[PDB]
Amino acid sequence: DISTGHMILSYMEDHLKNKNRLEKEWEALCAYQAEPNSSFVAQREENVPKNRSLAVLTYDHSRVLLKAENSHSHSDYINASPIMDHDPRNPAYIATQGPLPATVADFWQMVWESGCVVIVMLTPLAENGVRQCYHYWPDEGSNLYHIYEVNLVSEHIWCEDFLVRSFYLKNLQTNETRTVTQFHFLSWYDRGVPSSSRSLLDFRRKVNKCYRGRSCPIIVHCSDGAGRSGTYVLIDMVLNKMAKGKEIDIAATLEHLRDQRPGMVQTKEQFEFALTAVAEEVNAILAH
Ligand SMILES: [Cl-]
């Protein structure tokens, strides 16, 4: 563990500090091509409006399938990609776009059927007016999204950069009711990075003190569900490996991600950030 901390630091010296290797790797990464990588379903005429960003469409081989029988639009399609870590049965996350007005019922169906109870949201809803994600929850009281009643139970504001919202999610078909906890990071702007890595890391720690430990996937979204969402996942997967002890390849770990959803980590600056974040956390642990 501390052992693996020093192993990560060694890696950081060769891949974060050496700017040449950063570039080279990112250049490698940009050209990297997943196989398979078809997204024919996502590119159907019928699913065009269910996609926010034409640049980031879920692969046919790695998409969440809504149960068409319970679907709002009688369709299985949602732009969400399961993301496996250890286990090919149980994906650790579902990365998905910011739900659109057209797809909110769908987003909740995926939350219900995935058994998900922790959501991570890494965008504000608007950026100097530029919409990122539809306001898919009620700011007070109850809203109905198809057969999914969502009630806002409470809302806890930790700091300038993040808050938590607690929901009750009732399936009106089955009369069941679950608590879904939504972690909302507010200072991570489109195609950019947080100013404080310390905030994003504490935010992560809070996400995981609440998740620990559940079968169901964490639902991570932002905008395209690639850039920020992927930097989170990448940062979070690499520290989990430290969490449980040998070898470390962050570039290779990112490939594993891009095998499962295109676009993951949109910028070299974001990649640089994910690295800097892992390093800083590992500097803190080892300091103690
Ligand atoms: Cl089909």
Residue numbers in the entry: 724 to 968, 970 to 1012
How does the study describe this entry?
Protein tyrosine phosphatases (PTPs) play a critical role in regulating cellular functions by selectively dephosphorylating their substrates. Key features of the domain include the PTP signature motif, the mobile Trp-Pro-Asp “WPD” loop that in the closed conformation positions the conserved and catalytically important aspartate residue, and the phosphotyrosine recognition loop.
In the second category are PTPs in which both the gateway and the second-site loop are open and accessible as found in the R8 pseudophosphatase group (IA2, IA2β) but a cysteine residue occupies the position of Arg24. Surprisingly, sedimentation velocity measurements showed that all single-domain RPTPs studied (IA2, IA2β, GLEPP1, DEP1, and STEP) were entirely monomeric in solution, as were tandem-domain receptor PTPs (RPTPα, CD45, RPTPɛ, and RPTPμ).
